Amino acid sequence: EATVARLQDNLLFAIKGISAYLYHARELGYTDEVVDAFLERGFYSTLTNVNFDAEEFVSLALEAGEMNLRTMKLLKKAHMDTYGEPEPAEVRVGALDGPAIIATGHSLKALEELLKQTEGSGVNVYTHSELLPAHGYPGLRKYPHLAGQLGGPWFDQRETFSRYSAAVLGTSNCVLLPRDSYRDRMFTCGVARLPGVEHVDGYDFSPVIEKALELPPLKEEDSATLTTGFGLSTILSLADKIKELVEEGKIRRFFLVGGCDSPLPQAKYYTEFVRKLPEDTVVLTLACGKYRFNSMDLGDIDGIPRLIDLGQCNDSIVAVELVEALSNLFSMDVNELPLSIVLSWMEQKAAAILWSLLSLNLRGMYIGPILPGWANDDIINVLVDKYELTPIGDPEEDIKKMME
Amino acid sequence: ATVARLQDNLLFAIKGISAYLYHARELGYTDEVVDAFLERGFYSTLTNVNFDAEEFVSLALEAGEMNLRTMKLLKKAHMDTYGEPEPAEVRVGALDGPAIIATGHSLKALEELLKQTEGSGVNVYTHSELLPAHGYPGLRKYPHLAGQLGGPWFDQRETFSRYSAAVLGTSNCVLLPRDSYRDRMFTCGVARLPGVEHVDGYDFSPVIEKALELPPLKEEDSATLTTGFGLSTILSLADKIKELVEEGKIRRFFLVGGCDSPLPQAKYYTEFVRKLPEDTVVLTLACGKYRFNSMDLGDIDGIPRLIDLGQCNDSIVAVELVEALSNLFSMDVNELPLSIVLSWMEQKAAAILWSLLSLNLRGMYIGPILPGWANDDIINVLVDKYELTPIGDPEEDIKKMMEV
């Protein structure tokens, strides 16, 4: 039927995300055999004339969410064991004088190697989109020529890359066909590829550095700031203040807003939402959706930041950790916390994280811009009604329903 | 459009590789580099990672290489657990008494079923790609493995209908039951059908119970088939074939086989071998062999005109056999007297075709014609560089294949 095809394609999307995280984990030298065996099994379950059962495909998607939790935890372990655990970090958004390299994507091993290969050369390495969290890691902020942030979300890149006479390095996910304005100024490594752009051999970034030096330098602009790298230790070392502040009702609610973004007009929702959120709530944010609002002056709530940047998409594992630290902190069940979840969700890119969240039986979440919601019975009707997954609507009404 | 089609083709190759890897892990054999390639390949098919078609072709060739590797590892597993396949005569027809018909590919489920059915009084029959099982010494040794019953996979609704026996689908190429036999079929491993029981692990007790609660089978007219031509058997006959091809009494090796379908165009493969001259030998693989593996081809000085290399994943022995033939004739691989006629489905057997292409075998003839194939960019692109030839008329194609 149609639903069997839709369900196997969704499982394949989850397997893709898990494989992304697994690839980056292997690049840092961490490998889990059980997740690889699940990749084999799950992908194999989608060959023609093997499995015709929709409910078994839902079971497989939930097992995929579990495996995604496993590999996200493994990748977090890799990142912390190589670069330290991320601590809060304010980051400059604007050009500094000099030659420059803009690195975009997810991988921190490529950024590590580039930063190692750019010492003393006098080129500034800027982060973009999901390389912003790198600024919070001790073993990465230590390089002083990691200048700051430049640009915002991934889908702005053709704009950003256009207006900065800097070398361009797409390390991983969410890369986009270059304008010929900067095509000959762009490079890729790892798995990312663009036709007509040079691909770095291994981690030998001489071609980019050379290019960065053949280019007119950047000129310093008026900048702005961002905050990122809120690692778990920082958050649950603040547990006393959060306890005291939510017991007196001076912090009413935690909202978890974030996820993979897109230039969809409906995604403007996430800018309005946090804008209308009452000033006595705190927002936990991750992945690219953060650029919908992470530049707003939200303020402080008794010295606790109203915006808390947990990092990149694969840092979902810290959020799920925090809630189990929060529940045990309040002696509450997981669904008794003053927590609402508003996802920004792409079907292709972040199916794995949604299925991980459903594996934990989290009820009443709000889903991404458009609803890929598989129209037919078993999926949308039965699965939504069981997990009470909710499509986003109007910001004010959604906030009213979430506060109650 | 070509990028999407190439991502789909790479994913099909990954499907085949993951199938073979799953069965190999089921027997306890794991190759880390094929799993790392699985990760990389999956990740390279995210929406905004790789936009380069030539790199997707390179990925498909790397997939062919990895498929050769995993087919080799699965052959190693099968041989280390069940022995090396020796030629085997196979009974095609029902013996009176309770019966279980097993279909699919992997022999571990069949091994456990045969282990669990000694003394119980049920006859175990093979179907489709479990026909090669009859050749493994450590598996044919069970005397209640009666023989074969039916032919290709698409015979099942026919076969399963007309034999009141239990039905066990261990693996690929199963399809929704007719209500005549729905309640007597079972599945294990990866296969699933809505409304059919799925065995837990390898506990086939429900199936044997059903085989004993059903009316028994009735005596057959009997027929024969031959299978299990393992490499060792063939290249112990290598001197004789050298002597016979230098004497010009056997002109050409044809390699005909692969995935079949209830497509009318697939009738080609019945006519082809029917028209083949009596001075050629046919090496056959997968289920397509049932187009002709029951024909009276005869002997060429005690060398069988039809030689059944086994099941799809046994392509690896053919790839070895030719490499033994070259060194035997002091010939390079593409001047040997060998023609190759694939029966090929893009979904099911992309991996073996890409393996054959990784080995730079030039001028093969490809599977059945699907009306839409003419415009399909993949056939065009494969043809232009590797001179793959679409099948046309059997007689004309053999004429063009012989006089070279």
Residue numbers in the entry:
A (entry chain A): 88 to 491
B (entry chain B): 89 to 492
Article passage:
They play key roles in nitrogen metabolism, stress responses and protein S-nitrosylation in microorganisms under anaerobic conditions. Hybrid cluster proteins (HCPs) are Fe-S-O cluster-containing metalloenzymes in three distinct classes (class I and II: monomer, III: homodimer), all of which structurally related to homodimeric Ni, Fe-carbon monoxide dehydrogenases (CODHs).
This variant exhibited a homodimeric architecture identical to that of Mm HCP wild-type (WT), demonstrating the rigidity of the dimeric architecture. However, no electron density maps of rubredoxin and the [4Fe-4S] cluster-binding domains of Mm HCP C67Y were observed. This indicates that these regions were disordered, which could have been caused by the lack of the Cys ligand at position 67 in the [4Fe-4S] cluster. Owing to the denaturation, the loop region around Glu434 became unstabilized and shifted to the solvent area, which may have been favourable because the hydrophilic residues, including Glu434, may compensate for the positions where the [4Fe-4S] cluster-binding domain of WT was occupied, resulting in the stabilisation of this area via networks of polar interactions with solvent waters. Considering similar spectral features of Mm HCP C67S and C67Y variants and the structure of Mm HCP C67Y, the lower activity was caused by the fact that Mm HCP C67S and C67Y variants had neither [4Fe-4S] cluster nor Glu-coordination to the hybrid cluster.
